[PDB]
């Protein structure tokens, strides 16, 4: 056997990101496993995952006790895999509802062709092909074309009258057709009515209700209504043919996300495990899918099947938004569940909650105290805090006897290290459980050692309510055994401190190259002039003035 | 985690990030928002931007077009969470050297 | 001069910021539940990752600041080293 050449390249970066929607066939092509079972956990001795289920270990492990199946690893070295679920009846989308109710007015419902003229279509596509097209310019073009297409109710290609398209309920589309006026009699509507008069021989309660009989567009007919549209009228419909397509707008194949994206919680009060709400909704959708199949072979009424179809379409519709208004009272759920849209929206979200926040470690916060015994760029750090914080550094030829003495001292004494990392083997070892006299001997070039904070290190010191750019600064660290923060009173004006109840915080840079960037730009001696006016902000305090 | 009783850290918001941007230091900003916050290695294909595994794609079925990048866990989290909204984020890898 | 270079007097609002910048990701925090997010997938526009906020969200070194210029290493190197002959393949010996 021979190994195939496989090497990764680092000199690459993302330039552009194009948005687009996938189609069910590409969804299955990307998917790995297909769930068929609704049971989450198998009925065996101990808690074990069920194959071809919602909680399967083929999409990614979530704990420190079971390895992965696709590629043998842990959940730390694991990205995630997706799955595909086949749906018996196609469902509507909650975000692509306005798009489809607009397209239904754009194209016909019996011809699948745009309602425009040959000369106006050319004038519009001429405005389409331009070297400069912003996203705000295409927002108004769709509305400009929609009214022009809705003004005319009869197409020029064929001779059929469409009508209008309106929504009703929550997910229901009725095509306003077969209008009955009192000026002209139409042969189409008369034939439509007389074709229903033969069905009044069994039930006498359908003739007065016949005037409200119209076309009710269901996902089934809309599916082939989207598959009969010519691909040549797609660019003028403001729809990128490369990314999107008129067809893949109806949910037919559900994409199962990885299991590592939905962790489970356990409470140690009554032995209670609780899965993610996403998993509960997925396993509830599966239970709604087989009752329709079994009802088919068993045989139910048309209303009994339409109710289950609507329930299956509504349960997947509340899985993403879960905030849709105007729902039936009998179908209104009592419990409150958060979906994908609610994972996005909210103060405790992921856009401005995790990405913008991104809280960091290796920091602290303590009440400040006055101490006019240091310089302008100095700050006192307590011994208890300096023992917790650690700075990693690689051992050079000149840093051999400087780190060997530190590791000989130990972590109990202030000058010393806690964690030792090897050169080749990427593993960290404690200095409290192991020996220190032997670790100093076994030391080679290129070893990472995390030592305690000593005097002469660039540390960051700032307050929480920052207004200007001078609210954060970098000073030199100094160890002082008093369990309090101390700094000169001259730099109290940039921080706007009151020295009565203020709580100021402190950060320690980890990368050595970034340690030099905070010393030249975020320097106390350098930053003495303010950018707004140009006057020195650090002069004196009222006591020194007096 | 949040809170001092659970042995948690401090939060760095935009209030202080604007002050770091005004100075002009970018290495320190990425060191204490990406290096000491969340550092993850992710493999991406250049032909069709998607998340693979062990340098192997499942859409194009090819091992030639493959590369690796350092992306914070929050960004990959959002990228894998946005795929359930019928949205496929396709990245375009460009040569930084050339 | 920032609201006078492109067109007329543009205001710093939610609508004028969409006319100034053309990034959907930064507007994702300003706008609401899913409108822009679904219209982006519907239209299918390409977002260019060249904004400082985009560089902080993604994790790319920003352009402004210390990332504008590029460094260069200096050492001993030869632009074009002497090549090695190809004794067999010679055009005069082939007569094609």
């Amino acid at each position: 056997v021979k190994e195939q050449f496989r090497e990764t390249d680092v000199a690459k970066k993302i330039s552009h990101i194009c948005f687009g929607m996938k189609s069910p066939e590409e969804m299955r092509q990307q998917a790995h496993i297909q769930v068929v079972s609704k049971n989450l956990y198998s009925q065996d001795n101990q808690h074990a995952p069920l194959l071809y289920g919602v909680l399967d270990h083929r999409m990614g492990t979530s704990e420190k006790d079971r390895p992965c199946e696709t590629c043998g690893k842990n959940l730390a070295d694991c990205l995630g895999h997706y799955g595909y679920i086949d749906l018996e009846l196609p469902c509507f989308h909650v975000g692509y509802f306005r798009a489809v109710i607009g397209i239904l007015q754009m194209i016909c419902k019996t011809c699948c062709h745009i309602m425009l003229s040959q000369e106006e279509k050319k004038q519009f596509l001429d405005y389409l092909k331009r070297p400069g097209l912003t996203y705000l310019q295409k927002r108004g073009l769709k509305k400009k074309i929609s009214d022009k297409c809705r003004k005319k109710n009869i197409c020029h290609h064929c001779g059929a009258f469409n009508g209008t398209v309106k929504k009703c309920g929550l997910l229901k589309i009725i095509h306003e057709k077969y209008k009955t006026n009192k000026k002209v009699v139409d042969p189409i509507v008369s034939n439509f009515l007389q074709s229903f008069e033969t069905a009044i021989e069994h039930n006498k309660e359908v003739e007065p209700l016949l005037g409200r009989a119209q076309e009710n567009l269901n996902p089934l007919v809309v599916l082939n209504l989207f598959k009969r549209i010519p691909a040549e009228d797609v660019p003028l419909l403001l729809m990128n043919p490369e990314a999107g397509k008129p067809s893949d707008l109806i949910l037919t194949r559900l994409l199962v996300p990885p299991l590592c994206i939905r962790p489970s919680v356990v409470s140690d009060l009554k032995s209670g495990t609780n899965e993610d709400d996403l998993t509960m909704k997925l396993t509830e959708i599966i239970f709604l899918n087989d009752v329709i199949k079994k009802h088919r072979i068993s045989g139910a009424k048309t209303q009994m099947i339409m109710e289950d179809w609507d329930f299956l379409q509504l349960q997947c519709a509340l899985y993403i938004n879960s905030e849709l208004s105007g729902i039936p009272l009998n179908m209104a759920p009592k419990k409150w569940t958060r979906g994908f849209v609610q994972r996005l929206k909210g103060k405790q979200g992921r856009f401005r909650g995790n990405l913008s926040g991104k809280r960091v470690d290796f920091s602290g916060r303590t009440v400040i105290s006055p101490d006019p015994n240091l310089r302008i760029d100095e700050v006192a750090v307590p011994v208890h805090v300096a023992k917790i914080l650690t700075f990693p550094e690689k051992v050079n030829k000149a840093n051999i006897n400087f780190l060997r003495k530190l590791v000989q001292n130990g972590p109990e004494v202030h000058p010393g290290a806690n964690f030792i990392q090897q050169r080749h083997t990427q593993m960290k070892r404690f200095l409290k459980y192991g020996n220190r006299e032997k670790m100093a001997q076994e030391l080679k070039y290129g070893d990472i050692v995390e030592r305690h904070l000593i005097d002469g290190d660039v540390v960051l010191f700032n307050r929480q309510p920052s207004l200007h750019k001078l609210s954060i600064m970098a000073h030199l660290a100094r160890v002082k055994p008093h369990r309090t923060f101390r700094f000169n009173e001259c730099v109290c004006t940039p921080y706007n401190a009151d020295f009565d109840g203020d709580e100021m915080n402190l950060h320690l840079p980890q990368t050595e190259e970034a340690k030099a960037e905070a010393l030249v730009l975020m320097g106390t001696k350098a930053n003495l002039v303010t950018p707004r006016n140009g006057e020195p902000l650090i002069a004196a305090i009222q006591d020194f003035l007096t | 985690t949040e809170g001092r009783s659970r042995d948690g850290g401090l939060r760095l918001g935009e209030m202080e990030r604007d002050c770091l941007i005004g100075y002009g230091a970018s290495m320190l900003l990425l060191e204490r928002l990406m290096i000491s916050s969340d550092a993850f290695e992710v493999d991406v294909c250049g032909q069709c931007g998607l998340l693979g595994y062990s340098g192997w794609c499942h859409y194009c079925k090819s091992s030639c077009h493959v590369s690796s990048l350092r992306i914070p866990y929050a960004c990959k989290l959002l990228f894998q969470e946005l795929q359930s909204m019928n949205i496929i984020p396709r990245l375009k890898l460009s040569k930084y050297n050339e | 001069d920032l609201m006078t270079y492109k067109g007329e007097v543009l205001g710093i609002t939610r609508f004028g910021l969409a006319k100034m910048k053309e990034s959907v990701l930064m507007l994702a925090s300003f706008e609401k539940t899913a409108d822009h997010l679904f219209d982006a997938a519907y239209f299918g526009q390409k977002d260019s990752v060249c904004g400082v906020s985009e560089c902080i969200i993604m994790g790319i070194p920003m352009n402004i600041g210390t990332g504008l210029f590029k460094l260069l290493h200096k050492a001993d190197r030869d632009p074009n080293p002497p090549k090695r002959p190809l004794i067999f393949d010679t055009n005069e010996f082939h007569i094609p």
């Binding site: 103060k347 929480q464 309510p465 709580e503 | 935009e14 | 609002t13 609508f15």
Partner: peptide, 30 residues
């Protein structure tokens, strides 16, 4: 341009949070 209100439209950020200390005495981790 619609007559909207800055408070209800723009959702409260860390900018709005007024960090001030008052006496107010009396999740899966791996």
């Amino acid at each position: 341009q619609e007559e909207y209100d800055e408070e209800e439209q723009e959702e409260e950020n860390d900018y709005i949070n007024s960090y001030f200390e008052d006496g107010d005495d009396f999740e899966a981790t791996y």
